[PDB]
Amino acid sequence: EEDLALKQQLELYVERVQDPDAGLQRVALESMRQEIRSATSSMTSVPKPLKFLRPHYGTLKAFYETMSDSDLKEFLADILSVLALTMSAEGERESLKYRLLGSEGDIGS
């Protein structure tokens, strides 16, 4: 039940990111960043959040393409740069392109 609840939370966060409200978008993106940081600390297995968020990579890419410049854009660029680790085809430099457009936040996080 816990895995299903986490998957439901992830898809709900994606839907809230798709919502036009800037505040809700910021809240969802911050929650996604927090959970990604928490899960990545597990060195013993591929994070489940990545496995659950794999299908939404194209939708998030389109949403990035549809947004105007803003801090939300930088946070979403950081998220997509982190996500490209598992979905970028060999030779597709999406991660670096989104990182150069991302924030100058601490890489180690």
Residue 88, C-beta contacts closer than 8 angstroms, at least 6 positions apart:
94, 95
Q: Which helix (H) or strand (E) holds 93?
A: none
Q: Which helix (H) or strand (E) holds 31?
A: helix 22-40
* Plot region of 91 (φ>0 → left; ψ -120 to 50 → alpha; else → beta): left
- Count CA within 13 A, CB hemisphere, residue 8: 5
Q: What resolution does the deposited structure have, in angstroms? A: 3.3
CA 59 to CA 40: how far, in whole Å? Answer: 22
Q: Which helix (H) or strand (E) holds 50?
A: helix 48-53
CB neighbours of residue 80 within 10 Å? 23
